Every structure is written in structure tokens, then in C-alpha cells.
Amino acid sequence: MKYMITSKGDEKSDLLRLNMIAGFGEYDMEYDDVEPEIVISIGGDGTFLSAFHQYEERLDEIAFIGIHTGHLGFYADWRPAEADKLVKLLAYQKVSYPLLKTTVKYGKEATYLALNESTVKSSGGPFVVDVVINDIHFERFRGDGLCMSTPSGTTAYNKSLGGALMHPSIEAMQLTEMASINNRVYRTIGSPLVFPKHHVVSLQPVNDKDFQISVDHLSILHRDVQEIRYEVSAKKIHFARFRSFPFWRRVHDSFIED
Amino acid sequence: MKYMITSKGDEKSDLLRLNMIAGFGEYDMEYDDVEPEIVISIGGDGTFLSAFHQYEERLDEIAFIGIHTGHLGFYADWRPAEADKLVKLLAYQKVSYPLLKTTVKYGKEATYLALNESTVKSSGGPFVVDVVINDIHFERFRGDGLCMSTPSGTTAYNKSLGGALMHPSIEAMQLTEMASINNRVYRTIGSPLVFPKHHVVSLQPVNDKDFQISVDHLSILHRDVQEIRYEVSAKKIHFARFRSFPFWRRVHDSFIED
Amino acid sequence: MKYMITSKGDEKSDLLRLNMIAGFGEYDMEYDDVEPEIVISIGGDGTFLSAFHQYEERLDEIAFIGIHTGHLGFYADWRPAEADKLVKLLAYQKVSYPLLKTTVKYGKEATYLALNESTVKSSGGPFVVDVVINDIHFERFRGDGLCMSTPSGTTAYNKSLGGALMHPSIEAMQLTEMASINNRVYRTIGSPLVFPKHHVVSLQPVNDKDFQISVDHLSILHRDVQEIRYEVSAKKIHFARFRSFPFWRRVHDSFIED
């Protein structure tokens, strides 16, 4: 089976990568970074996010695995001491997490998939966007920006913005505010909002039409944006899982104790 | 078809109730408060919560409707000006919202269903409960209490505790903290937590074993409690719906503007 | 000089107390728990709060010292390994922290001093109090309760309610909400509020007139309350200080790392 390994690029991750390639060479495993069926990411969650986006156009053909060469990751949830054990196993069940579809319309159109979140922020100071939910005007937001998170993204930016942590088996997306203005003139809901599949959340400009839009680790200034549309994707990321490591335990282990 | 009408008991709600009974008398509708198939609640959301608990043992045989004789309710989402219009319609589709199952174990066992939420608070000062998720010890909570909310309950106590607002088509429950202590000795997650169906959240005492447990509007001091167990119920509440009034619009109308 | 020592009452604190009494016996120090000039509290901050209230009527005649026989306290900020060193020193400068004056009016009047905070909570469910600031109606609060904190109290209940941490050299008091209801009908400020000396914050009932009022570790159900009035006290608590242990370092040491 074709596999590839991305590395964070520090000495520990590079050497672990080379040692795992050696191990795979002892099985019927072919290294192929063009059409892998298995993508192993060695590093932390940033490395894992890069692996996802490197292969996002072949997501249904790939099972991802993450090895953390520092602290426990939510994606990189395997320790380097089990690298040799993991090679033997690869040569399993699959677990799928929901993804966020982001559409950017100009005046053509571009789509992006997010594993953690997509955000929109101002070209300086506070910006103003109308928030439309299923074609219904919900609020006029004035403030620093907005963050739309996947379930597995809820432990990342979403959490620091006060959002809820959502088990990734729930097919949903969660919208959180960054520093909204609320006075007698300006009003937002304030609370995070959790949307099911097939709900569409549209952000539309009011005066300024330039924004910084991020998708996971990738931030891009978009000019002449007419709309940013969020919906739970029909596409899913698949993990190879070899043991039970429950999400709520990953949460406990990362934020409570370990 | 058998129906009954509960009233808030003020002059406006009582008279509306009597006028609707008169209207129903002009159709093949029988007033029956023992085995109604239709339960109309005239008042506000507190009246609607009482109607739900009055008939909670026959939930699958009943379609509920709420009329608000004050401001818009999330359950009582019909205006008194449409009472006559509603009688004609009753004589429709059904919409179902998830419910919260609460189990209280002593040392027998009692179960309760919640439409908004169930909370646990101390017999004075801060109390200490261990929080166990699917048999896995997640945190030791020290503070004022904990709130487990349904989706439609997320706009109620849950919202004032910083929880996310969740569309009620999502079969989930949401746990929020009330004033947790966090220092070098005590640690909680802080964030609201959203659980899917078939996850079980167990609260267990540490020293003191007496607690105040609420279910919707009903608060009861429970002695010698060993455990409080939360799970999304298999039971659902059914609404009679006659027009589109989207949840996100009810949110906008109650918290943003109207 | 007359001194006394309170103990948490566990084996470690009792023995440390007896060993310090022995040390003081080697100097011109007289043990006197009726009219001490020095009050040493051995335990944690709860013990220190009890010492303060045991001698609150002679506050200007007393310098307090706290020894923590567990983790670092904000009041009990001396380690047991320096007990012998502390005896020699006692036989120094003084540092003073502001206090909170609480007045409870019925229909006579009672005053209390708080070192951490005074709170008001409901006789069940949410309660409703009008909040009047310098005789000006500021808001109608509906929710779980309100907390008025001193500066040194800001790291305690106030912090868990989202309040700011305030250096205790600032003569002020800070008001924080517990779970307020905010919808189209009910409105509060939400933010913590910080008041200088000579500002008076009055809480007044709306319907129910029974409340639970706490002052530091002491919680008391007050019947037929007409008003609870908060102001920065003219009285101050005095600490004996023998070394520099800055407040911001105590904060770092308790909440960040140590």
C-alpha cells in the first residue's frame, strides 16, 4: 500500500520519519507522496494541518495518522515510542470527522475546506459584516472578526473565543465572535452558535469590502469579496485508528492533566 | 380530537382560553385533560414548561402548542391575535425536539425528563463533584454547580452561563459550569461541553452527598445521592407547527430585535 | 507584646502552632487571645478569614500574619519552614488592605466587614433586585446573585465570576453578576463594575424580600430585608510584612506557575 510521511523538519521528526520509512521497507509498502493511501504526519498539530491541506483533493482515498514529537496533539495523538508498533499495524478501522466548507464569492467563486476553522477579520480596526442564516438576516456584527469551527476545531481558536467543545461525531459547525461592540446602537447575539448540516451562514460586507480570510493555518487577504458562505461539508477526513483514545480523554489530557 | 388548554391564570390568558374552548366547540373537538392529543399552553415559557411536565408520561401521544400572552417565547411562539386562526387549523405537520434524561441514584433510582435543563447545586457554598464521561474520570469540579441543557434549553439558563446556542435538530446535550474555582490546586475545563446521543455524563459526590437538583422549573433537595447521570433521551417532545418560524429567527426576535 | 495563634486544627498546623508558642516563650511575648496585637493564622486562606472575623472589632490594634501549611495562600503567604525565622522577627513594617462595608437594613440595621467579598443570592431559583448607585437606579437584575469584592478578594469568588484582579493598593470594590438573564425584556450591564471610595451601591428587593447574604465564609438567610448597601470601608486590615512578596507575584505563583 502506498504511503507518505510529512515531517515537522526538526532533527527528532526527520529521524523518526527516516526510521519509519526503513520499517515500512520491510513490508509490502510503497512510498508514494503523489497518490498515498496512508499519510503519516510527524510533528504537532500544525504539521498535521499542513498534511491535510497537502492532500485535501484526495481526502476520500486517504487515512491520516499523526505522531507528536512534542506534547500530545488532538490530531497528532500517537507517541514516537510507538512508531515501530504503528508500522506493523499499518501493514485497522477508520474514523471520520466532519469538515467545514467555505465559499468565497467575488464580483468568480472559490471554495476551501477547513479541518479546524475559517475566520474573517478586518483590514484594520473593527469591520462590519451582515450575518445571514438560511437567507434570513440575523445580525449586523461590528468588531474584530468571526470564527467558524469544525467539531475537532472546537478545542483550538474556537475554545479561546469562549466556544463550546463539541464531540466530533456531531455533524455541525460553530460560530464565535471576536470582540463585538454592543451598545444602544450595535447588537450581536454574543453567544457561540452551533449549526447542523445543510444550514448556510453567509457573511456580507456593509461598507469596506476587503477582509482577511483564514482557513486553518493559511491566511489570505481577499479583495472585492461579496460574500463568505459557511456550511458543513459533505466531505470528511478519515483517520486510521488502531486503539481507543476517546476524544474526551484527549481533551482531559491536553487541558486538565497528564 | 381530544385537546386541553392550560392557562397562566391571569385575566388575559384565562379569557383567551375560554374563547378558544368556545371555538373548538364548533368543531369535532372534545375537551379532555386526562388523555389529550393536543395540549395548548397560554402564557409564557414557564406555563409551557408546566404543560410539558403535566403530560410528560404521554409525550408520544401529544402535540404541544404555545401561545404567548406577553412577549415572544421560544416555546410559546404564537400570538393571541391568531387564536381563532389556530382553532381552525387544529381541526398539520409535527416537529420534534430532543429531551434530556436525568437519572438520580441513591443508596433506589429515579428518572426525570427535562425540556430545558437539569442542574445540580450545593447545599451551601461551593460543592465538589467528580465528573465522569463514559466511565472516564474527566475532572473534579469545585464551585457553584453544573447545568446540562437540551438544544431548545440552550437559549435559557445555558445561555446565561456562557453556553452555545444549538439548533434543536441536533440530538445533543450541553454541560456548562457555574463559577468554578481554578487555581494551582483545582482545575476544570471551563468551556461548555457538547455531547452526542449515547454519551453518558455522571456526576458523583466527593465529601458532601446532599445536593439541590433541578429539572426545568422544579427544584428538589436530594439526600444520599450517589450519582446523577445525564444522557440524551430516546423520548422527544412533538410540536404542532402550522407555519414556518425558524429557530434562528426566534433567537433573533428574542435577543437581537423585534 | 501580646500575640495569639489560630490553627486550622490538623496535625501539621497544631504542631507548628505549639512549636511557635515555644519559640515566643523565649522572648518578651505574652500569649493573649483576648487582646492580641499580633494574630498569626496557621492553615490556609479559610483559616485566615476566620482569624480576621474573630478579631474584626479590634482591627486597628492588630497586625495579621498567615502561614500556609498547604499550598501558597494570598493571605497565608508564609511557609512553615520560616516559622522559627518569623518568631525572631516579630520580637517590621505594616501593610494595609481595603475592606468592604456591608449594611443590611430591615423593617433595624446591621453592618458587616468583609475581607474577600459579600454576596447576595436567592431563596431559590432566580431572584430580582434593583441596583441603585449613588441614589440613581442603574439596573434591574434577574439571575442567581451578585458579588461585591474587595481588592484582595478579587482573586477569589470575583475571579471565578469573570471579575478583574485589582491591586490591593487601590481603594475600591468590584461588583460582578452571577448568571444574569438578558433578553428583550431583561437587561443588565453584564460587565464587572469597579467603584471608588464614597460610592454607595444599594440592592433592593422587587417581589421576594428574603435573601441569602454571605460575608466571607459566613452565609446567613436574612428575612424582611429592605436593602443591602455596599461601600468601601473606612477600616483597613493591617499585615505585618517582613519581606517583599509582591501581590502580582502572589498572583503569578497561585494561578500561573510555581
Add this chain to the structure above:
Amino acid sequence: MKYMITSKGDEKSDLLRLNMIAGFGEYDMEYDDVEPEIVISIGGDGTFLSAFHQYEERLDEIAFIGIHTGHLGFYADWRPAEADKLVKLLAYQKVSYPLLKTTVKYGKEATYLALNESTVKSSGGPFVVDVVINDIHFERFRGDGLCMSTPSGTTAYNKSLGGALMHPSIEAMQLTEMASINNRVYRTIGSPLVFPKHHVVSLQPVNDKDFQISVDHLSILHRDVQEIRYEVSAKKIHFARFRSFPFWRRVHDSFIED
């Protein structure tokens, strides 16, 4: 007495300005925008902030007044219907609010005064700054940025970041976080922090040394910054006051009702 009038520049504010200049022409008042003793700002709080910075080098020689031609401002707290009444009065007591001193050190040095706040944000994504309080390392902050507010600034950016509202008679500054990361690896205090006069808060880079620093409405990318130092200024802004309009009432009027 020399005065000048700034205008928001819309039709309503320009005409009010011209009408007030006419009124002043009937008294011994000389229009002088180089050395005014009275500075009237007609617009909203943004106009008032611009007036402050236009004359910040002569603050002790000037009494400011703000007229709001839209909704009530915290600085622009006079209605256009009292413009004629205000001219007669000008031809009073003075009220002074504290200011924030910001020092930017490179590798020379630049100082700025803020009426609302000074913030520091990243040249993209999260940035990392060490926070040093009175030469004591307090925390390593990773996240979107930090906001240091004056008392009268607490109702502005500070409030949207969860900070406390502080009466402006308190000589203090308040530090609030923007979206900090908190996991097993990264730790911040989370709570807003309130500092008295003569405390110095230093922000220092860790890797990246470029930042966006704002002072009130003015945002400037600073290259090769070694340190940003915050302290309560010795300088104060002086308002001409002609009637009692208490701060807590301005708060009520802007955020609760009017």
C-alpha cells in the same frame, strides 16, 4: 478666551459648529485653533478622540467639551439642543480623567498618550509576548493581542474584551487579553488586571519583533520593537463641566436604556 471647534464634517455637525461660532462672536471669545483654552468637539466619540490627539501637547491648558450629533457619547455627552445654552456658560468647574502613558522602545524611544486605550496585535496569526510587571516576569502570552485601557476607556474596547468598567476617578489602567491560547503548554492569567499608578507593565517580544500598536484611533506598525511599556500618566485630560451627568448614569444611558 480662545476656543476652537472641531466637527465630524457631516452637514449637521458643520452647521452646528458655524452656529456656535456665531454665538461666541457675541461674547469676548476669540476663535483660535493654535492656542485654544476651550476645545469643543461636535460629532461622536471618534471626533472627540481626534480633538484630544490634535491638542495632546497642550492638555493642561485646555478644557474639552463634547457635543453628540448622534447618540449619547461617553465623551460627547452634550445634546445639540443645548448648544446655545453652552455658549452662554463658556463665556464653570473642571473635571479631570486619567490617561495612559505608552512608551515604545526600539534598537530610540517614543511616548504616546491614550485617552481610551493602547493595544498590541500581531503581524499575522497569534504572536508571543512576555509580560513583565514591575520588572517581574508575570506570564508568556500567546494569542491575538493585549489591550491596556484607561478608566474612561473601560467602556470601549476593554468592555468588549470582558474587562471591568472602572469609575474614572480611580487612577489606574486595566489590561485585557484578546483570545489567549491556554493548554498544557501555554498559560495566561485570563482575567483582566487592574494596575495603580507607578506600576509599570512591560511587553517584550519572544521571536517575531514586529507588532501593530494602536493608541486610541491610530494604528501603526512598529518595526524592531524591543519593548512596549505602560504606566498611568502623570498628565490628565480636563473637561469643562456645567451640570451633573454622573459616569454611572452615562453607562446606564449607553448600555441599559435611554
